[PDB]
Amino acid sequence: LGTATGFDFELIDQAGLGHEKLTQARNQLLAEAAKHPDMLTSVRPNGL
Amino acid sequence: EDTPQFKIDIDQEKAQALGVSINDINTTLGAAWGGSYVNDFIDRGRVK
Amino acid sequence: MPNFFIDRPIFAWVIAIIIMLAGGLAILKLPVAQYPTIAPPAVTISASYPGADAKTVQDTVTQVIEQNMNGIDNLMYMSSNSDSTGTVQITLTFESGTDADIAQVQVQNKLQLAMPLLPQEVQQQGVSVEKSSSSFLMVVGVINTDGTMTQEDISDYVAANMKDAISRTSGVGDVQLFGSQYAMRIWMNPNELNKFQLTPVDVITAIKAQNAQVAAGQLGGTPPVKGQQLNASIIAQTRLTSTEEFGKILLKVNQDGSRVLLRDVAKIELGGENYDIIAEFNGQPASGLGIKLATGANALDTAAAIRAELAKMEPFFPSGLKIVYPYDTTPFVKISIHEVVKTLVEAIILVFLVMYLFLQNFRATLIPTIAVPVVLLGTFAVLAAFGFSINTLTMFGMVLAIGLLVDDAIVVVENVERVMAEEGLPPKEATRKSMGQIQGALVGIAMVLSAVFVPMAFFGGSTGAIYRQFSITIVSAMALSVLVALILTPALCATMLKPIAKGDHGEGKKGFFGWFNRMFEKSTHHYTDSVGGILRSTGRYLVLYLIIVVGMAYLFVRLPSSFLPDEDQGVFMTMVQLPAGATQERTQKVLNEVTHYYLTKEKNNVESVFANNGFGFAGRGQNTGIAFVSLKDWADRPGEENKVEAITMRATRAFSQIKDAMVFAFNLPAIVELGTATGFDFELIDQAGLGHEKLTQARNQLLAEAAKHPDMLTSVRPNGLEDTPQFKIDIDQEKAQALGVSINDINTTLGAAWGGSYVNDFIDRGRVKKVYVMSEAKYRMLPDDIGDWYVRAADGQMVPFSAFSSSRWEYGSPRLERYNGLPSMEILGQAAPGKSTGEAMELMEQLASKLPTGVGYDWTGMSYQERLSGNQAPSLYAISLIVVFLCLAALYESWSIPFSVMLVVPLGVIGALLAATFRGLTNDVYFQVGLLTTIGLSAKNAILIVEFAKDLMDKEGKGLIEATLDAVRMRLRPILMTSLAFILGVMPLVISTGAGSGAQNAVGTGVMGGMVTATVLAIFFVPVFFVVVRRRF
Amino acid sequence: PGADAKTVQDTVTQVIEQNMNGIDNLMYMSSNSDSTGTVQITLTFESGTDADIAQVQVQNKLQLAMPLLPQEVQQQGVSVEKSSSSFLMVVGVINTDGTMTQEDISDYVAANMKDAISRTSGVGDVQLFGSQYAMRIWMNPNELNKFQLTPVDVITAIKAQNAQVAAGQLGGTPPVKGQQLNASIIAQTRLT
Amino acid sequence: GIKLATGANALDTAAAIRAELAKMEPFFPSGLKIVYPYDTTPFVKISI
Amino acid sequence: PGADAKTVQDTVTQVIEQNMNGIDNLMYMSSNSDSTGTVQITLTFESG
Amino acid sequence: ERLSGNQAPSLYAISLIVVFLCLAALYESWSIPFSVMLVVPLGVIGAL
Amino acid sequence: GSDLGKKLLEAARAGRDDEVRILMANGADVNAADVVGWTPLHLAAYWGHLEIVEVLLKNGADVNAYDTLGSTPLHLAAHFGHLEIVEVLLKNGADVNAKDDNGITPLHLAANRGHLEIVEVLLKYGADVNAQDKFGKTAFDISINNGNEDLAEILQ
């Protein structure tokens, strides 16, 4: 079913940027995520 | 339609008389003229 | 509704027509086969490891594969065995109802993934996943009559020139070669090898190097130099093609410029892949194809097709070569079909004759003759629809349904003829009334026989599949027979029967007929006077009913039970086992003796013997062998003395005289793959890692105790092989390392020379074939010869194999069962005479419970099935009896009247049991279905009488005894006619002898003996039953 | 065995993924390669996909990739499984005597219970909370050098001396005329 | 730890596993014992 | 790889084909073997 | 194409029989169906 | 060869004492050898069937019979750990210093499978402890290589 209002989202390296650049992209997304807590909750990675 | 074919014949006896390994012979002839896949490498994140 | 079609005969004709058209089309399109598939899906994995012993096979192959058989679906049990010719077999047995193709591919994929964990030699050899089928359509033997080609040659020919032909032949779903195609055999000579200082290792590496495929590329291949004009392939080395080439392989160049050539150290020839089987057919070399019929295929056609193809192969046969057909099920299937078609025709001639004898006008005698084919035709339709084939089971179920089919016609036509004679009504008003008088009962009879036969299909496993055949055949026949009797024959009656005067019972006629009619009218008064007396004195008859019920109870349990009778099949077989260590030559001398006996003492009956040295059920080895024996026709072998059961008794006695060789014969099971309905299959399991020797002991301990209850267990035995002397050779690592000798050199020298070593492929005559290196037999026979093989040291010196080895005998297992993953031993036995299987199993379990800890047991095979679905019969038959009640309750609108009818059931059963016990026959499925039909038919007559009787009270206000006597009078003629016809109709089956006759005997006896008592007893007991219940309630 | 997340992705995961094409009803496909040396590629199908054929297909494309995977990875056995992500049940096994260590209990579960349950129809996957045993050689370099041997020498000698060896028969077919004896030849066997 | 194959019946399969474990229990070494820490199937039986 | 069409036919196409016997609903079967070493075999099944 | 031609006659024959029978059953008549079944060439000639 | 001698070989191996008893009542051959030279004493000595061992010896069985490659029932017994059979056999004159065709001695085999009692018994009855096999190994050598220190001590 999913974990209720849980959303499940994927960030893709569509251009050969590398693991390292994609990590910075994810960091950049996550930061901005925390800037709208009226809309987004418990946003988090799933990996190490 | 029927194509021609170039039959090259290795002389095992003369190869042994001149101390050359039929396996290097076979590998030279094969690699040079037909190509040989060797292993993979990574091209901007893709196994190739 | 039957009014509808009395007024609309065309409509009803159309329905007839349509049904007959659907029937005829199904007849052109239905698969023909001996039996349906009844065994559950089984998938057998198979592998081989040349020169390897049963332990090596198990520890490197069988365990690996079994460890990976995970996550396949609907598996029931897995079981394996690993043996000393390097073979493994792993059989996964699936739930009944598994898609064998889903099952086979699931087995095949996990194996694939397990393939990198196997020995490299075994990977090189391949491992085959296959659906398990002992079902062969026929076996074509191929033999050379003029001593020009060996068994291998024949086989190679058959492979190269005959196999694929047959494979493409229509209706052939699978083909197996009884032999190998050629292989390139290098037969090494160790004296030469040591002369030039070479080993099997040099020989192998030279064959891998000089018999190679070398990719080379192209002239002018992309990317080219622009302006190139030619693009051509470069062909470099390809595979060798002749022995001349192999012999010219260069091993060593000398210090002398001379050449050590592979022909200078080895003998080179085409030969077999193995030499483990010697196969002969009347002493001459032989090979063959085993042909299985394809799904949906027609057996009679495929056979013809196979033969057709063969004939157009004969023009290119090399001189001396001849085809032979030592096993072919299609003549059975032909006889079967001809015999059933025979019976079904005699059936309508009989209803003709009986119909005329009584009713004596041709117009009536038409109405069954139309209606019976309509239903039989339309039964093939429903058969096809449910996906059934025309097989032996469905065919005899056709025969068991004649009585019910015949009767529906006779009942409707006669009751119109009687209403006419008694009431003087025109045939349209008379049928309309007559239908009004049986229309409910006929529908009732449909529901009730449903509740008889339908429960039978819902048995589980192998047995449920055999009952499913009869169930669907018989319910279909009867259901259309009710349709046809509510749709077709009412119409036909209203529009074909000539009128009859009121009171005209034909007594005023003259000649044979008028006499018969007065004679019968006298006997109907004779009869009703008799029953009227019986009805003054019900008590002694209730006492007689208990006597009947009691005799049936006694005869039931003391009639032995099987599930299908054997047949004189035209074929039987003969095991030949010899001691531990017995050679192939020795086993051939026994088989030679066995062969000579049949072609001398049984010249009159025997056509051929096929002698396979190296093979058997329990296992394989130079010391075992099967002869297969094929007889002339049942019409050239007169009388029971030339039956198989005779010929085998004789031969078995003759061969007990044979020294150092256990030798015996026996018939083939009715349905291949099934085993004795009196038998059990016992798996004894090492459940906590005890080891071989421990499980062997626990077995003999279990076998001893077993022999201590002869009253309960008989023929309790192991299925596998016994441990045997073997040659343990140990390699001194220390002496090897010190002498500069690699142990990989050592173990491939040994393995190649003494065990054979598969190298690579060559192409003989456009066919790809294997290359094996092995010693000449002359140097690999005796422990003494181990010192003649030399291995080269690092420093080039040639070190004799003895200088770094040592040796001793130990004992070891030449076969090694496993079961659901653990080591096992398979124990076989049956219940001692007069005892049931479930008992012999109860004891076998308790005898095991007192076995050493770490030893367990399971039930496999037939036993696994009956343990899970041998309990159902009284469950199922209960629901049956409940519905039959529930139905008759609704028919008559009475909770009590049902019993009157139900009470008829012992009356048919008794004579079936009597006729069985008399003729020595058995409680088997043909007998049991025939019971079911004998019950159903005598049920039928009961239901009609009670109905007529209950009606006469309900509607016309008659007193009980008045109604019962009138009922029993009107229903006397129809009951007589049906039984006389039917009884006569099942006559040829009882008398039948020769071809395929145990099946006919089984059906015939019980149906006829059950009918004599069902007819005689009922006409009296049924009015009795009815009056005691109406009175009590 | 011993591969980091990248060695596993660039020598296994990718090679596999590039073959996972043309597969009926596939919705997505994710995969993790981790430094324990493990891959799991997870092909997810539309609802109503027959899981049998869905497995038959994935397996088909996978066996094209197999020969391209490292030898180390093949001998570790590649698996293909159709199960629910979640756990149906956990079967625990303890010892109330304490005759048996955590490590021994696990080796018993793995060698005497697992396989039968892995073979039970319905059972999509079984995780052994522990580990079957292995003959563990634990090398010491201080002695390896002291004799001038290396891990290479070791693996060689185990392969040589823990050998299960096919070696033929005496009086084996095709035999010599007049042959007396038919007996297996037993040479090296697995160590125990 | 057991994962239920695709489509398969949870209650039915739990059963089959129990029957299989039963045939092993009589061969357990001294003091070896099964226990049942996590099972999602009883709730199905009870709630129904 | 690298084998003539005849070699590839003797050792690969013929082998596979002779096992494509008795399969349900098989209408016909076509197949070819070329000089690059490729093989394709196409079994066509009765519509339905 | 060879198959669609081979089967076409049989198709036409059973389609006539069906219509006829349906007519006999509906109109309780063998005459009404045979009157009708003779208009068939009149339509077939115009299509042809 | 005889009907009975084969029956005795079978019963000897299987340990069917009463069969052996009846067979000995009938003059079955205590010298019957199977396909590889094993007499029923061999069979008994190997398979661990003390009763039959005695019965056979009582009935004229040869305790120092030897097989195709030299193994004596003592060899088998010492090797498979049948202490009591060892003792009986040596009591009844079994050569404790028998060498098979590898120069293997019941000491060697016993040393090797590590049957310390059987070693000492064999030593008691005079097992030459400095005997060497084909490769010059003494039961001590077997003992040090197998890592058996108690054995090593017993062979001093």
Short mmCIF file of N, CA, C and O in Angstrom, two decimals, chain C residues 821-898:
data_model
loop_
_atom_site.label_atom_id
_atom_site.label_comp_id
_atom_site.label_asym_id
_atom_site.label_seq_id
_atom_site.Cartn_x
_atom_site.Cartn_y
_atom_site.Cartn_z
N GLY C 821 16.62 -34.97 -0.55
CA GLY C 821 17.84 -34.28 -0.24
C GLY C 821 18.82 -35.09 0.56
O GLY C 821 20.03 -34.89 0.42
N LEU C 822 18.32 -36.01 1.38
CA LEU C 822 19.09 -36.82 2.31
C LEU C 822 19.41 -38.16 1.68
O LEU C 822 18.75 -38.58 0.72
N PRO C 823 20.43 -38.86 2.17
CA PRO C 823 20.65 -40.25 1.73
C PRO C 823 19.46 -41.14 2.09
O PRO C 823 18.76 -40.92 3.09
N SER C 824 19.23 -42.14 1.25
CA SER C 824 18.03 -42.95 1.42
C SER C 824 18.33 -44.37 0.96
O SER C 824 19.35 -44.64 0.31
N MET C 825 17.44 -45.29 1.36
CA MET C 825 17.36 -46.61 0.75
C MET C 825 15.90 -46.97 0.54
O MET C 825 15.06 -46.80 1.43
N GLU C 826 15.61 -47.43 -0.68
CA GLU C 826 14.25 -47.66 -1.13
C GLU C 826 13.89 -49.12 -0.90
O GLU C 826 14.52 -50.02 -1.47
N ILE C 827 12.88 -49.35 -0.07
CA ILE C 827 12.45 -50.68 0.33
C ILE C 827 11.11 -50.98 -0.31
O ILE C 827 10.20 -50.13 -0.31
N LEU C 828 10.99 -52.17 -0.88
CA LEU C 828 9.82 -52.57 -1.63
C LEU C 828 9.19 -53.78 -0.97
O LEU C 828 9.91 -54.66 -0.48
N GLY C 829 7.86 -53.84 -0.98
CA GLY C 829 7.15 -55.02 -0.52
C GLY C 829 5.66 -54.86 -0.74
O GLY C 829 5.17 -53.79 -1.12
N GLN C 830 4.94 -55.96 -0.49
CA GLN C 830 3.48 -55.98 -0.58
C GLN C 830 2.91 -56.62 0.67
O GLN C 830 3.63 -57.25 1.46
N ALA C 831 1.60 -56.45 0.84
CA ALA C 831 0.90 -57.07 1.96
C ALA C 831 0.70 -58.56 1.68
O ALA C 831 0.27 -58.94 0.59
N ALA C 832 1.05 -59.40 2.66
CA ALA C 832 0.91 -60.84 2.52
C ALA C 832 -0.54 -61.20 2.20
O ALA C 832 -1.47 -60.48 2.59
N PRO C 833 -0.77 -62.32 1.48
CA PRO C 833 -2.09 -62.56 0.89
C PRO C 833 -3.21 -62.46 1.91
O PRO C 833 -3.08 -62.92 3.05
N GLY C 834 -4.30 -61.83 1.50
CA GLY C 834 -5.42 -61.58 2.39
C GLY C 834 -5.29 -60.34 3.25
O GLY C 834 -6.27 -59.98 3.92
N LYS C 835 -4.15 -59.68 3.26
CA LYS C 835 -3.97 -58.47 4.05
C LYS C 835 -3.93 -57.25 3.14
O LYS C 835 -3.47 -57.32 1.99
N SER C 836 -4.43 -56.13 3.66
CA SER C 836 -4.55 -54.87 2.93
C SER C 836 -3.24 -54.08 3.01
O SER C 836 -2.40 -54.30 3.89
N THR C 837 -3.08 -53.15 2.06
CA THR C 837 -1.85 -52.37 1.98
C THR C 837 -1.67 -51.47 3.21
O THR C 837 -0.59 -51.46 3.83
N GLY C 838 -2.72 -50.73 3.59
CA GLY C 838 -2.67 -49.88 4.77
C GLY C 838 -2.23 -50.59 6.03
O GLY C 838 -1.70 -49.95 6.94
N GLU C 839 -2.42 -51.91 6.09
CA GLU C 839 -1.91 -52.65 7.23
C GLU C 839 -0.41 -52.88 7.11
O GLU C 839 0.36 -52.46 7.97
N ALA C 840 0.02 -53.52 6.01
CA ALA C 840 1.45 -53.76 5.79
C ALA C 840 2.27 -52.49 5.96
O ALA C 840 3.46 -52.57 6.29
N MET C 841 1.67 -51.32 5.71
CA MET C 841 2.33 -50.04 5.95
C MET C 841 2.34 -49.67 7.43
O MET C 841 3.36 -49.20 7.95
N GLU C 842 1.21 -49.85 8.13
CA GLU C 842 1.19 -49.61 9.57
C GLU C 842 2.33 -50.35 10.25
O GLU C 842 3.08 -49.75 11.05
N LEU C 843 2.53 -51.62 9.90
CA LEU C 843 3.57 -52.41 10.56
C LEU C 843 4.95 -51.92 10.15
O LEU C 843 5.85 -51.77 11.00
N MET C 844 5.13 -51.65 8.85
CA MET C 844 6.40 -51.18 8.33
C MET C 844 6.82 -49.90 9.02
O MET C 844 8.02 -49.67 9.26
N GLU C 845 5.84 -49.07 9.40
CA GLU C 845 6.11 -47.84 10.15
C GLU C 845 6.55 -48.16 11.58
O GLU C 845 7.50 -47.55 12.10
N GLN C 846 5.85 -49.09 12.24
CA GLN C 846 6.20 -49.43 13.60
C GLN C 846 7.55 -50.13 13.67
O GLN C 846 8.40 -49.76 14.49
N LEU C 847 7.78 -51.12 12.79
CA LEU C 847 9.12 -51.73 12.70
C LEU C 847 10.20 -50.67 12.52
O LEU C 847 11.31 -50.79 13.06
N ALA C 848 9.90 -49.60 11.79
CA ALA C 848 10.88 -48.53 11.65
C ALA C 848 11.01 -47.72 12.95
O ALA C 848 12.12 -47.35 13.34
N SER C 849 9.89 -47.45 13.64
CA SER C 849 9.95 -46.65 14.86
C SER C 849 10.97 -47.20 15.86
O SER C 849 11.50 -46.44 16.68
N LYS C 850 11.25 -48.51 15.80
CA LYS C 850 12.25 -49.12 16.67
C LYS C 850 13.59 -49.30 15.96
O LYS C 850 14.29 -50.29 16.17
N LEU C 851 13.96 -48.36 15.10
CA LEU C 851 15.22 -48.36 14.38
C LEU C 851 16.19 -47.40 15.05
O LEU C 851 15.79 -46.63 15.94
N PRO C 852 17.48 -47.43 14.69
CA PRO C 852 18.45 -46.52 15.32
C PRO C 852 18.08 -45.05 15.15
O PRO C 852 17.60 -44.63 14.10
N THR C 853 18.32 -44.26 16.20
CA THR C 853 18.10 -42.82 16.09
C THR C 853 18.99 -42.29 14.99
O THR C 853 20.09 -42.81 14.75
N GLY C 854 18.51 -41.26 14.30
CA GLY C 854 19.16 -40.78 13.11
C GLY C 854 18.70 -41.45 11.84
O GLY C 854 19.24 -41.14 10.77
N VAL C 855 17.74 -42.37 11.92
CA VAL C 855 17.17 -43.03 10.75
C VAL C 855 15.69 -42.70 10.71
O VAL C 855 14.98 -42.90 11.70
N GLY C 856 15.23 -42.18 9.58
CA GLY C 856 13.83 -41.85 9.42
C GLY C 856 13.22 -42.62 8.27
O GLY C 856 13.87 -43.49 7.68
N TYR C 857 11.97 -42.31 7.94
CA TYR C 857 11.35 -42.99 6.82
C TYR C 857 10.28 -42.11 6.19
O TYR C 857 9.67 -41.27 6.86
N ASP C 858 10.03 -42.33 4.90
CA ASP C 858 8.92 -41.68 4.23
C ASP C 858 8.28 -42.66 3.26
O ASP C 858 8.82 -43.74 2.97
N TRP C 859 7.10 -42.27 2.79
CA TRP C 859 6.32 -43.01 1.82
C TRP C 859 6.39 -42.28 0.48
O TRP C 859 6.12 -41.08 0.41
N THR C 860 6.76 -43.02 -0.56
CA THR C 860 6.98 -42.49 -1.89
C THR C 860 6.13 -43.29 -2.86
O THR C 860 5.57 -44.32 -2.51
N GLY C 861 6.03 -42.80 -4.09
CA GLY C 861 5.36 -43.59 -5.09
C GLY C 861 3.87 -43.72 -4.84
O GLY C 861 3.24 -42.89 -4.19
N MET C 862 3.32 -44.80 -5.40
CA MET C 862 1.94 -45.20 -5.17
C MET C 862 1.54 -44.98 -3.72
O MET C 862 0.50 -44.39 -3.43
N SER C 863 2.42 -45.43 -2.80
CA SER C 863 2.15 -45.31 -1.36
C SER C 863 1.96 -43.86 -0.95
O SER C 863 1.02 -43.55 -0.19
N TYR C 864 2.84 -42.96 -1.41
CA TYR C 864 2.66 -41.53 -1.15
C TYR C 864 1.26 -41.09 -1.54
O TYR C 864 0.62 -40.30 -0.83
N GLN C 865 0.78 -41.59 -2.67
CA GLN C 865 -0.53 -41.18 -3.15
C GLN C 865 -1.64 -41.72 -2.26
O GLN C 865 -2.44 -40.97 -1.70
N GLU C 866 -1.68 -43.04 -2.08
CA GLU C 866 -2.77 -43.63 -1.32
C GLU C 866 -2.77 -43.15 0.12
O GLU C 866 -3.84 -43.01 0.72
N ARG C 867 -1.59 -42.86 0.69
CA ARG C 867 -1.54 -42.27 2.02
C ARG C 867 -2.27 -40.93 2.06
O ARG C 867 -2.96 -40.62 3.04
N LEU C 868 -2.17 -40.14 0.99
CA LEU C 868 -2.83 -38.84 0.99
C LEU C 868 -4.26 -38.90 0.46
O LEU C 868 -5.11 -38.11 0.90
N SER C 869 -4.57 -39.83 -0.44
CA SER C 869 -5.89 -39.87 -1.08
C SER C 869 -6.35 -41.31 -1.23
O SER C 869 -6.76 -41.74 -2.31
N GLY C 870 -6.27 -42.07 -0.14
CA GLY C 870 -6.79 -43.42 -0.11
C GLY C 870 -7.91 -43.51 0.90
O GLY C 870 -8.58 -44.55 1.04
N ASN C 871 -8.11 -42.40 1.60
CA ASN C 871 -9.15 -42.22 2.62
C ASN C 871 -10.47 -41.73 2.04
O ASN C 871 -11.50 -41.82 2.72
N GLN C 872 -10.44 -41.20 0.82
CA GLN C 872 -11.55 -40.39 0.33
C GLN C 872 -12.79 -41.22 0.06
O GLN C 872 -13.91 -40.73 0.25
N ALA C 873 -12.62 -42.47 -0.40
CA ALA C 873 -13.74 -43.28 -0.91
C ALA C 873 -14.98 -43.20 -0.03
O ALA C 873 -16.06 -42.85 -0.55
N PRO C 874 -14.91 -43.45 1.29
CA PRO C 874 -16.12 -43.33 2.11
C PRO C 874 -16.56 -41.89 2.34
O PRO C 874 -17.76 -41.66 2.54
N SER C 875 -15.64 -40.93 2.36
CA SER C 875 -16.09 -39.55 2.29
C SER C 875 -16.96 -39.37 1.05
O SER C 875 -18.17 -39.19 1.16
N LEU C 876 -16.35 -39.50 -0.13
CA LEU C 876 -17.05 -39.22 -1.38
C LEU C 876 -18.39 -39.93 -1.49
O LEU C 876 -19.42 -39.30 -1.75
N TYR C 877 -18.38 -41.27 -1.35
CA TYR C 877 -19.60 -42.07 -1.50
C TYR C 877 -20.69 -41.66 -0.52
O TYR C 877 -21.88 -41.79 -0.83
N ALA C 878 -20.30 -41.16 0.66
CA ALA C 878 -21.26 -40.55 1.57
C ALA C 878 -22.02 -39.42 0.86
O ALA C 878 -23.25 -39.48 0.73
N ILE C 879 -21.30 -38.39 0.37
CA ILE C 879 -22.00 -37.27 -0.27
C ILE C 879 -22.89 -37.78 -1.40
O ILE C 879 -24.03 -37.34 -1.56
N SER C 880 -22.35 -38.68 -2.22
CA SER C 880 -23.14 -39.41 -3.21
C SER C 880 -24.50 -39.90 -2.66
O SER C 880 -25.57 -39.50 -3.15
N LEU C 881 -24.46 -40.75 -1.62
CA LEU C 881 -25.69 -41.31 -1.04
C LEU C 881 -26.59 -40.22 -0.47
O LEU C 881 -27.82 -40.35 -0.51
N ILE C 882 -25.99 -39.14 0.05
CA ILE C 882 -26.82 -38.06 0.58
C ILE C 882 -27.58 -37.36 -0.54
O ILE C 882 -28.78 -37.06 -0.39
N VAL C 883 -26.92 -37.06 -1.65
CA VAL C 883 -27.61 -36.36 -2.73
C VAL C 883 -28.67 -37.26 -3.34
O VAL C 883 -29.82 -36.84 -3.53
N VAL C 884 -28.31 -38.52 -3.62
CA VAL C 884 -29.29 -39.47 -4.15
C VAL C 884 -30.55 -39.47 -3.29
O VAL C 884 -31.68 -39.38 -3.81
N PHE C 885 -30.38 -39.55 -1.96
CA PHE C 885 -31.52 -39.35 -1.07
C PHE C 885 -32.22 -38.03 -1.35
O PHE C 885 -33.37 -38.02 -1.80
N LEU C 886 -31.53 -36.92 -1.06
CA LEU C 886 -32.06 -35.57 -1.27
C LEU C 886 -32.84 -35.45 -2.58
O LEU C 886 -33.88 -34.78 -2.62
N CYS C 887 -32.34 -36.09 -3.65
CA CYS C 887 -33.03 -36.03 -4.94
C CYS C 887 -34.37 -36.75 -4.89
O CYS C 887 -35.43 -36.16 -5.18
N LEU C 888 -34.33 -38.06 -4.60
CA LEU C 888 -35.55 -38.87 -4.56
C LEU C 888 -36.59 -38.26 -3.63
O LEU C 888 -37.79 -38.36 -3.88
N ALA C 889 -36.13 -37.63 -2.54
CA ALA C 889 -37.03 -36.86 -1.68
C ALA C 889 -37.80 -35.82 -2.47
O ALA C 889 -39.01 -35.66 -2.28
N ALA C 890 -37.12 -35.10 -3.37
CA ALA C 890 -37.76 -34.06 -4.16
C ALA C 890 -38.60 -34.65 -5.28
O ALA C 890 -39.66 -34.11 -5.61
N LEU C 891 -38.14 -35.77 -5.86
CA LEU C 891 -38.94 -36.46 -6.88
C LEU C 891 -40.32 -36.81 -6.34
O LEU C 891 -41.34 -36.45 -6.92
N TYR C 892 -40.35 -37.53 -5.22
CA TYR C 892 -41.59 -38.08 -4.70
C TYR C 892 -42.28 -37.17 -3.69
O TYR C 892 -43.39 -37.50 -3.27
N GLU C 893 -41.68 -36.05 -3.30
CA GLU C 893 -42.22 -35.21 -2.22
C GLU C 893 -42.52 -36.06 -0.98
O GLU C 893 -43.65 -36.13 -0.47
N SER C 894 -41.48 -36.76 -0.51
CA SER C 894 -41.57 -37.63 0.66
C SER C 894 -40.18 -37.90 1.20
O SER C 894 -39.30 -38.34 0.45
N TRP C 895 -39.99 -37.67 2.51
CA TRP C 895 -38.71 -37.98 3.12
C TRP C 895 -38.49 -39.48 3.30
O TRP C 895 -37.34 -39.92 3.45
N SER C 896 -39.56 -40.28 3.28
CA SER C 896 -39.43 -41.70 3.59
C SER C 896 -39.34 -42.57 2.35
O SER C 896 -38.62 -43.58 2.36
N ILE C 897 -40.03 -42.20 1.27
CA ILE C 897 -40.11 -43.09 0.11
C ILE C 897 -38.75 -43.36 -0.52
O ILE C 897 -38.50 -44.51 -0.93
N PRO C 898 -37.81 -42.36 -0.64
CA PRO C 898 -36.42 -42.65 -1.01
C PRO C 898 -35.85 -44.00 -0.61
O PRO C 898 -35.19 -44.67 -1.41
#
